[PDB]
Design a protein around this nucleic acid. Structure first.
Lengths: 486, 184, 475, 349, 493
RNA sequence: AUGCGAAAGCAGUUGAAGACAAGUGCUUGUCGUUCGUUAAAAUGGCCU
């Protein structure tokens, strides 16, 4: 049991346990009327009105292991409907933020704790935050560009939020899972729902693409293997629901995950295309059949290297013809029409491959001119008209081992008119690295040789994008959504 | 030329800092049941019920007093411990709110009313121990606090009244318990 | 209409209206120029109120009722301040006031002068040859109140000190219902039951002009300096005469006309409008009695104006706390997979005893039945010789057809395996010549990759089954 | 002039109410609608019109919050498994009750509900209450402001009707006595302050086929008072029974004899009895049948004598189905099947 | 609280050649009916005004069938020799019928008693007769004399306009909808002729080289002509006066051809053709005339026709088989006191102020297995999923759902051999298919894990596993050679 | 389960003290206790 209360006269006993349900117990009949689906766990609940008019209750949304994510409800009892649904921006991170602990149940899973388990977990987590030099906190966050609305890929459920009203407008499930028809208790809790890996919008703004993965129930033959699913969703620009136009199972073959998604430029297909980039070096390009009514693959390049690199990146020139796939340690330019190395018939030292100092984690292009590549040691700005590296920037000390490969790309983001901004974060150590952090952010220019402008903020910064009026948005560990403007 | 600022707010600041679960909810509804008050991590919001609308949002970055109380960048220790509707100083002035920090801070503001740059500030002494609860029946107030000498907490009950002089909040040691575990 | 009577204050900022609420008259004042449902009820179930007026320092109103008595009623204070009475049992028809003097006029032709501040009947009064009467007003003579006007279908000018009529202008057929002094030289008479308004001049005692409405007149008001005349008209409309006292100009037409219409095509009337210098106020009714107001600039509006007001006629109840369709704005729309097409990343698309003659015939054409016969055909030697005799393009479409056939009818696969085997055996060169092998051979690709994907778990099942089989067979 | 004459009604008129404070006439009939009229002597106009979808109405009543009085509700119910509630100016605020707390099997349809008031008497706050006719004894009793399930009582046999009785006791103190009636002629009387107990049970004299019961003279759900100071104890009891009979009872001695005797019998009517109501005073007992035109009469009390100059054969009554006085003004509005209410004003009031 | 999501049934990854809506439509054309005639059947037509009738030609027998009961409604048999063709006037009252003796009978429908007029054109047999479609008093005929004659039914005697320039055995013509002066003739040497009547007309306005003997001609557009001749058929444009496309996806010479449009169909316009091999095909004029559907009857199908666009009745598809068979495939289509009592129903509230609605949409059937899932009765849900008459696909989605929620060993704990045996029978049936194989393999794995000792005990279960092992070895093998042949795919790229 | 790594895997990990309970001062257990390290149960299920 989590919450208990008597109503003001006391004949009604509210019970607010784990399973997503609140029971009302009429004492005399020893019976109950009970609301069985409330989007998380009832951490608190009580009756409010001077007569018994509204119930208030605080919910947990325990799907997110990364953070205890409260949500408030004021509930007209008469209808048992919800008058006030107070929300917060609810991301999901790589690891749990400082001193946030899973609630208590009969067993200890990756969602709940036993009591000695709770204490031991608390101490070991604090010790790990003190000790480990691997911790990172960054999450995919997406901008609806034609309505400029933040999307959080909360696990198996997208949260459509926006700052203009400071309020979340929608919350949609996108997984054929255990999504809502159930109040998990112990081993349903042991199980975890499929995970939304990536969400992207088509630049045109009438499509999302979502990539997700699903894990089998544990301890069985099929448990070891995974499965990866891709889904194309439509909607008209006015409603607030998403309609799954086309699902694809197992892109690039079984357990061959798609690692990165690039929406197409407006040039090639009115931005009605996408690219899936693997961990093998394989690249697929999906487009939309309009004479039929679906999405389908149209242009592939399938190498199966006997090696695996979890870190990839890729970018596309505005023209829609030049494609830059940075696989680990080497970038390649490929023609859109042939998907092959751009052979230099003139041979002007414009070699199709760039083999770099380190494995590439991020690639971006600002214009037809300047390529920006981050290796975990360095940042490298390279001219394209003349195949020579323009600028080098020492980054290795800032990032030693505190990042799992594949997050700097959504950290660093570039204005496609003006420039790009750097992201570095540190915790001040006191004679020992404390819990508090500190992030310096330097706006870089097209050349990157001149720093457009430096700023420093205290709390750890978890994501940045840029609103398309040439301004920038940063998401912080505390759901403090901040803006860099002119 | 470039401005970096905080705009949108999230987290709701549960009474988790207790963790002993006196009453995890902190919000209260209006005396005229049209208005609900949710203090987030960074701003306290007024929700109107007949249209589900945050009418005004009270940032903590405009007024320095809230900035000095909850926005000191060395530590985020100071945060709300309680919130009441009436006014401690005068009996039945209306659009008033009183907020209570763990660290003895009492700040009086005017919900649906422009924040004049002198909100009624007050401090509570004897808070070498931290504060946990403040409430009232008619007139009289009671406060609970956390102190120590089993990883447990001593809960000191005090009786609170006001105004022997202006700044003074009269506090008397009502009772105390040494090692509480659950308390509702 | 249920608003029996009403009138603004001077300057037209609050309006006092009397309407009946279940066997009782009730008065209520409401603002116009920026809800206070404090209403005053008449305790008597029988008596009504005949006329009402305002008074400006403390503001109040004046009620002349059937009983023969007058109430001076406080506006903010819910109370009649004083109960003036006439020493009789008669019926008050009209009242008028300016300065401190008050004059009220009976049906029995009794006139009364009263002092407000003295709370006193200064003088009872009555004259000769005013046999019937229903209108009273008193002129702007300064603080002197001589030469007042009474009226019943023949307007009469009377002085007080010598107590006799002086000027009788020819009135109308009906009793007259509105009598208001326009100017120190001119006064307006609006006789109820007619569309014709009389502008009369006093010293010459003469009919200056006549004014025409379009339906019957009910209410008349005039602006500050005879600038405008506003008439509320019985069909429900507003008529505005601009500068009517200028230059047969005897009869003058309504210059400007106003109506009120909702969006649904319904018409709702006006009652007791009010106008001022380039400022116009109009009152109407949303519900049966709730009064509502509009302010505007008549000098810029056209000659004819049809105000539109949003009224809830047949609108549908989009309750805010819900979605457009049942759902409530705290739900989470569930997983409506719907009719999406589902596919995998393996449909590579969009990138000597022979029967050769008949199979090639069917494939040039397209016959499931004939193809089905030539597939129930078996002999491997025959299949080989046929494919040898076959031509490459027909061979390629043969591969596609056969693979599709397998994909549907799985069980047939074995013999179709040997068929496709011989096919791609014999005709390899032409297809390696033809470029787009993936898309052209698509279905075969996907079918075989599906079976490949099956392989490993199949091995798993096989081995566990052997384990159990040996387990029980050993004993 | 016909109230409905403002805006017609396309079905029978199934129930009426006069709002206790403001002048408002609530009419609801199987047109699935609700209409609220402002009442003149001359010009009744259509204040509002709430028309549901997929639901009939078979009783709609006004109701006032007793402690706030700035909140007035209208409770609508037809033959379904829910009761709509409506709050009291642009597009309305309507809620629903449907959720019985396990006592669901009793009340399969909400078609007969009576609204009343109740004080908790440990705490002494008042709240609105809604009584529900059920299956075999079950008067199920719901907390109006909440939608919860308060208390259930069971008269025996088959329920056929009931009523609400009030007693003041002392300043700010009173008590509600449910008076229920099985068809056969057995009348139970429960109180409600303490959970439902049988205060007293008796047998009506005769009255085999009993269909309606009402009380009048003090305060009741037909003349609901304004403040707890305005609550009185009721005096006249009427049992209207199927063959057309009415037995009138004096509470003072019926209660103290506990097997009483009728004080009078009224049987001018000849057809089935549907509506017993009183004037707020309790001076006039309005009885009205429902099986034939011209089927209404008024009775003088305490004489217990039927009036004999109304209604004559030129009274355009029609099949009366709802009888509604007004509290103060002295109006009697009567609603017949053909789709029209009609007004009469009594002068002595 | 939000409503309960439905258990989503599973969809497999798609297989090639999914059933298209065109297939739904044209296969829903069903309920075939066969009539045996005396001799070959030549021409078919439909009544345009009220589509409730169609006419069939034959050897000395013209039969009118009704679109309502598919039996002969009327017969004309006054024909001395083989009557070739029948045509209904663009307003229906009147049909023409060209015989072989050398005349045409023109008389009004439904009245075999009246020979309204008999016109004697050239003495050679007349193969083609039709009404106009823009005029209603102009009737066109042609005869083996290779000269096509337009008569005006007001003048029975002289050819209103003789028309020459043909080559050999003219046997088709048609009119152009937009132009009431333009007539196309399909001669039998190919080389379609186009004529304008208002000129002298001795020569066609122009010609088109359809090399084979062309057999039929229809105007699909005011701008487009469809030409049925030889093995393929061709589509031509008028203003450009150039061919647009051909379709030759048949075996023999295309024989009968007809175009319909603007009728209830996912396809906007349809073209149907008859190709001597049982094969009648449906194309569309929007996808560049691609094959969309087809049937096969035994004999050489000489005629084909469809119910016109305003049928508003059971639609029909008439095929005439030179084997002497007419075939049709079709698609089919209290007390007054009591009411004055309760008359308030049929109102729906037009004229009140604000209309609320809340009633719940009547959700579809809640199946018992879904119900067990909801009420946690896992074993009951499984047994229900293994009751006989359930679809294999639904059972597969059931098992996948149970696995996904993970209560597998849950549903299998209390299981005893009698409970296992239906499970095992379904397992044996399902192992063969692919997705079925994966899931059932997992299931039988856990079954074995639980039930080894009872397997030792029970004799029946052992032979069950024996059969299982046989099948699994077999499919392991088949998969192996499947991988070999994918190997050749990789080679032979 | 830690770290590293690909969806594989490679290494590493399971410490004490305190306390209390049961058992005959001793045996087992337990922890709303500490520091130290990279560390299966209470017949009991989802509204209209």
């Amino acid at each position: 049991v989590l919450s208990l209360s008597f109503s003001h006269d006391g004949s009604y006993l509210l019970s607010g346990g784990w399973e997503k349900v609140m029971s009302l117990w009429q004492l005399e009949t020893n019976s109950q009327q009970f609301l069985p689906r409330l989007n998380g766990i009832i951490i608190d609940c009580q009756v409010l009105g001077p007569q018994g008019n509204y119930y208030s209750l605080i919910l947990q949304m325990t799907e997110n292991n990364s953070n205890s994510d409260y949500q408030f409800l004021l509930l007209n009892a008469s209808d048992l409907t919800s008058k006030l649904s107070i929300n917060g921006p609810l991301p999901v991170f790589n690891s749990t933020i400082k001193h946030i602990q899973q609630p208590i149940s009969a067993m200890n899973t990756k969602n709940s704790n036993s009591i000695t388990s709770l204490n031991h977990s608390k101490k070991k987590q604090s010790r790990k935050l003190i000790k480990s030099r691997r911790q990172d906190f960054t999450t995919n966050v997406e901008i609806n560009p034609i309505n400029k609305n933040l999307y959080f890929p909360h696990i198996s459920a997208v949260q459509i939020f926006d700052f203009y009203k400071n309020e979340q407008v929608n919350y949609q499930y996108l997984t054929s899972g255990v999504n809502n028809s159930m109040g998990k208790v112990r081993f349903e809790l042991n199980l975890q729902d499929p995970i939304i890996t990536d969400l992207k919008f088509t630049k045109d703004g009438q499509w999302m693409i979502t990539y997700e993965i699903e894990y089998p129930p544990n301890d069985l033959l099929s448990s070891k293997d995974l499965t990866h699913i891709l889904k194309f969703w439509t909607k008209n620009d006015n409603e607030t629901n998403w309609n799954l136009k086309t699902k694809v199972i197992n892109p690039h073959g079984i357990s061959v995950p798609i690692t990165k998604i690039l929406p197409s430029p407006r040039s090639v297909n009115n931005s009605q295309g996408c690219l899936t980039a693997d961990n093998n070096g394989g690249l697929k390009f999906w487009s939309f059949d309009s004479h039929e009514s679906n999405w389908c693959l149209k242009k592939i390049s399938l190498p199966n290297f006997n090696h695996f690199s979890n870190s990839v990146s890729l970018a596309w020139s505005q023209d829609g013809s030049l494609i830059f796939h940075g696989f680990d340690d080497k970038l390649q330019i490929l023609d859109f029409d042939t998907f092959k190395k751009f052979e230099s018939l003139e041979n002007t030292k414009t070699v199709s491959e760039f083999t770099l100092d380190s494995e590439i984690q991020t690639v971006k292009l600002i214009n037809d001119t300047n390529l920006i590549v981050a290796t975990r040691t360095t940042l490298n700005a390279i001219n394209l008209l003349r195949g020579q590296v323009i600028n080098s920037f020492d980054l290795y000390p800032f990032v030693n081992g505190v990042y799992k490969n594949g997050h700097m790309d959504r950290l660093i983001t570039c204005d496609e008119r003006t420039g790009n901004i750097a992201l570095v974060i540190n915790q001040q150590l006191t004679d020992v690295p404390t819990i508090n952090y500190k992030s310096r952010i330097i706006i870089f220019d097209s050349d990157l040789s001149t720093k457009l402008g430096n700023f420093t903020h205290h709390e750890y910064i978890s994501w940045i994008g840029w609103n398309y009026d040439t301004d920038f948005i940063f998401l912080d560990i505390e759901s403090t959504l901040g803006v860099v403007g002119t | 030329q470039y401005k970096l600022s905080v705009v949108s707010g999230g987290k709701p600041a549960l009474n988790n800092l207790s963790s002993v679960t006196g009453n995890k909810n902190i919000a209260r509804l209006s005396q005229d049941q049209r208005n609900y008050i949710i203090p987030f991590n960074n701003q306290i919001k007024v929700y109107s019920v007949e249209t589900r609308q945050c009418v005004k949002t009270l940032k903590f970055a405009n007024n320095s007093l809230l900035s000095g109380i909850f926005l000191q960048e060395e530590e985020n220790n100071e945060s709300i411990v309680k919130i009441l509707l009436g006014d401690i100083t005068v009996p039945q002035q209306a659009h008033l709110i009183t907020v209570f920090t763990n660290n003895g801070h009492v700040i009086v503001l005017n919900y649906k009313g422009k924040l004049v740059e002198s909100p009624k500030h007050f401090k509570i002494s004897l808070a070498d121990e931290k504060l946990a609860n403040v409430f009232h029946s008619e007139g009289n107030y009671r406060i609970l606090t956390t102190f120590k000498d089993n990883s447990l907490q001593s809960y000191r009950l005090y009786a609170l009244t006001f105004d022997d002089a202006k700044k003074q909040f009269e506090v008397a040691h009502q009772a105390e318990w040494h090692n509480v575990i659950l308390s509702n | 209409s249920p608003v029996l009577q009403s009138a603004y204050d001077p300057s037209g900022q609050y309006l006092c209206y009397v309407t009946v609420a279940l066997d009782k008259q009730r008065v209520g004042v409401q603002p116009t120029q920026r809800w206070n449902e404090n209403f005053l009820y008449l305790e008597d179930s029988k008596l009504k109120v005949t006329c009402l007026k305002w008074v400006n320092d403390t503001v109040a109103i004046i009620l002349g009722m059937n009983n023969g008595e007058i109430w001076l009623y406080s506006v903010l204070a819910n109370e009649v301040t004083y109960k003036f009475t006439t020493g009789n049992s008669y019926e008050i028809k009209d009242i008028d006031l300016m300065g401190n003097q008050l004059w009220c006029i009976d049906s029995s032709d009794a006139f009364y002068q009263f002092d407000l501040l003295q709370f006193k009947l200064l003088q009872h009064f009555r004259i000769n040859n005013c046999v019937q009467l229903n209108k009273l007003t008193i002129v702007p003579a300064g603080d002197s109140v001589a030469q007042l006007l009474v009226a019943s279908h023949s307007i009469s000018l009377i002085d007080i000190e010598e107590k006799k009529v002086v000027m009788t202008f020819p009135g109308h057929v009906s009793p007259v219902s509105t009598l208001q002094v326009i100017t120190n030289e001119f006064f307006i008479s609006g006789a109820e039951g007619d569309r014709f308004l009389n502008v009369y001049d006093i010293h010459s005692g003469m009919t200056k002009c006549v004014l025409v409405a379009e339906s019957d007149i009910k209410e008349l008001s005039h602006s500050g300096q005879a600038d405008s005349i506003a008439v509320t008209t019985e069909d429900g409309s507003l008529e505005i005469f601009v500068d009517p006292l200028v230059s047969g100009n005897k009869s003058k037409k309504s210059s400007k006309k106003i109506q009120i219409v909702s969006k649904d095509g319904r018409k709702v009337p006006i009652y007791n409008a009010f106008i001022n210098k380039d400022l116009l106020n109009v009152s109407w009714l949303q519900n049966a009695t709730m009064p509502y107001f509009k302010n505007l600039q008549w000098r810029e509006i056209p000659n004819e104006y049809t105000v539109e007001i949003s009224l809830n006629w047949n609108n549908k109840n989009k309750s805010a706390d819900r979605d457009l369709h049942g759902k409530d704005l705290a739900s989470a729309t569930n997983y409506v997979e719907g009719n999406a097409r589902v596919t995998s990343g393996d449909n590579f698309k969009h990138v000597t005893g022979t029967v050769t003659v008949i199979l090639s015939q069917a494939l040039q054409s397209n016959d499931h039945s004939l193809l089905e016969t030539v597939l129930n055909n078996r002999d491997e030697r025959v299949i080989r010789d046929t494919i040898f005799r076959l031509k490459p393009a027909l061979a390629v479409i043969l591969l596609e057809r056969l693979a599709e056939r397998i994909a549907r009818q799985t069980h047939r696969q074995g013999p179709l395996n040997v068929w496709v085997k011989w096919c791609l055996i014999i005709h390899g060169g032409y297809l390696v010549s033809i470029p787009n092998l993936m898309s052209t051979l698509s279905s075969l690709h996907s079918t075989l990759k599906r079976r490949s994907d099956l392989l490993p778990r199949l091995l798993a099942l096989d081995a566990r089954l052997d384990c159990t089989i040996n387990k029980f067979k050993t004993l | 002039k016909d109230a409905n004459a403002s805006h017609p009604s396309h079905s029978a008129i199934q129930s009426l109410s006069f709002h206790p404070s403001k002048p408002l006439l609530l009419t609801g009939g199987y047109d699935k609608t609700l209409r609220i009229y402002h009442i003149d002597g001359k010009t009744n106009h259509l204040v509002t019109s709430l028309h549901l979808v997929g639901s009939p109405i078979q009783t709609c009543t006004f109701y006032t919050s007793l402690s706030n009085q700035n909140q007035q509700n209208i409770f609508t119910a037809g033959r379904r498994r829910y009761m709509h509630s409506w709050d009291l100016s642009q597009t309305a605020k309507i809620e629903k009750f449907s959720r019985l707390y396990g006592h669901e099997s009793t009340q399969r349809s909400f078609e007969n509900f009576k609204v009343a008031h109740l004080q908790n008497s440990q705490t002494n706050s008042v709240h609105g209450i809604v009584l529900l006719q059920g299956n075999n004894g079950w008067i199920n009793i719901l907390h109006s402001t909440s939608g919860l399930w308060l208390m259930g009582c069971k008269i025996e046999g088959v329920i056929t009707d009931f009523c609400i009785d009030y007693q003041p006791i002392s300043r700010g103190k009173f008590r509600t006595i449910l008076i229920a009636v099985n068809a056969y002629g057995e009348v139970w009387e429960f109180d409600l302050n303490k959970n439902g107990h049988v205060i007293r049970r008796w047998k009506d004299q005769g009255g085999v086929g009993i269909t309606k019961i009402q009380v009048g003279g003090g305060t009741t759900t037909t003349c609901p008072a304004l403040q707890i100071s305005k609550i009185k104890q009721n005096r006249w009891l009427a049992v209207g029974s199927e063959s057309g009979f009415v037995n009138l009872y004096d509470r003072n001695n019926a209660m103290t004899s506990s097997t009483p005797t009728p004080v009078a019998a009224l049987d001018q009517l000849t057809t089935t009895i549907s509506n017993l109501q009183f004037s707020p005073d309790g001076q006039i007992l309005c009885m009205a049948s429902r099986a034939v035109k011209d089927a209404l009469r008024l009775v003088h009390l305490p004489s217990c004598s039927v009036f004999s100059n109304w209604p004559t054969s030129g009274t355009p009554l029609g099949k009366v189905t709802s009888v509604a006085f007004s509290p103060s003004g002295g109006l009697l509005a009567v609603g017949n099947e053909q789709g029209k209410v009609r007004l009469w004003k009594l002068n002595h009031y | 609280s939000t409503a309960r999501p439905r258990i989503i049934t599973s969809k497999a990854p798609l297989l090639p050649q999914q059933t298209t809506p065109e297939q739904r439509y044209w296969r829903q054309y069903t309920s075939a009916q066969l009539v045996k005639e005396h001799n070959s059947v030549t021409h078919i037509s439909f009544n345009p005004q009220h589509p409730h009738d169609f006419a069939v030609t034959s050897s000395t027998r013209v039969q009118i069938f009704s679109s309502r009961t598919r039996q002969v409604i009327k017969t004309f048999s006054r024909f001395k020799d083989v009557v070739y063709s029948a045509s209904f006037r663009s307003d229906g009252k009147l049909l023409c019928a060209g015989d072989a003796t050398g005349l045409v009978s023109v008389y009004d429908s439904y009245n075999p008693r009246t020979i309204l007029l008999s016109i004697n054109a050239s003495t050679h047999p007349t193969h083609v007769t039709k009404f106009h479609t823009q005029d209603n008093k102009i009737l066109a005929t042609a005869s083996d004399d290779r000269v096509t004659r337009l008569w005006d039914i007001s003048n029975a005697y002289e050819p209103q306009l003789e028309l020459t320039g043909a080559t050999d055995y003219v046997r088709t013509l048609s009119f152009i909808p937009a132009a009431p002066h333009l007539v196309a003739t399909g001669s039998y040497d190919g080389l379609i002729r186009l004529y304008d009547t208002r000129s002298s007309g001795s020569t066609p306005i122009y010609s088109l080289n359809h090399d084979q003997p062309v057999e039929n001609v229809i105007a699909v557009s005011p701008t487009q002509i469809v030409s049925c001749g030889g093995n393929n058929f061709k589509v031509w444009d008028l203003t450009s006066n150039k061919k647009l496309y051909e379709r030759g996806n048949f075996n023999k010479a295309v024989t009968c051809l007809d175009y319909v449009e603007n009728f209830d169909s996912p396809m906007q316009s349809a073209l149907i053709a008859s190709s001597l091999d049982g094969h009648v095909k449906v194309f569309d004029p929007l996808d560049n005339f691609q094959v969309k559907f087809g049937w096969k009857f035994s004999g050489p199908v000489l005629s084909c026709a469809v119910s016109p666009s305003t049928a508003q009745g059971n639609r029909h598809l008439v095929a005439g088989l030179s084997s002497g068979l007419l075939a049709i495939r079709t698609k089919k289509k209290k007390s007054n006191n009591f009411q004055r009592m309760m008359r308030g129903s049929e109102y729906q509230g037009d004229q009140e102020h604000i209309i609320h609605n809340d009633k719940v949409r009547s959700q579809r059937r809640m199946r018992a297995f879904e119900r067990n899932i909801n009420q946690f009765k896992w074993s009951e849900a499984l047994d229900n999923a293994f009751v006989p008459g359930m679809a294999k696909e639904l059972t597969l989605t059931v098992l996948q759902e149970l696995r996904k929620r993970g209560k597998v060993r849950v549903a299998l704990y209390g299981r005893d051999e009698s409970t296992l045996e239906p499970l095992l029978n379904w397992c044996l049936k399902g192992i063969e298919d692919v997705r079925s194989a994966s899931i059932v393999a997992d299931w039988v794995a856990v079954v074995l894990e639980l039930y080894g000792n009872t397997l030792e005990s029970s004799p029946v279960l052992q032979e069950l596993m024996i059969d299982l092992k046989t099948k699994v070895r077999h499919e392991i093998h088949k998969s192996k050679e499947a991988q070999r042949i994918e190997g050749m795919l990789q080679l032979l790229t």
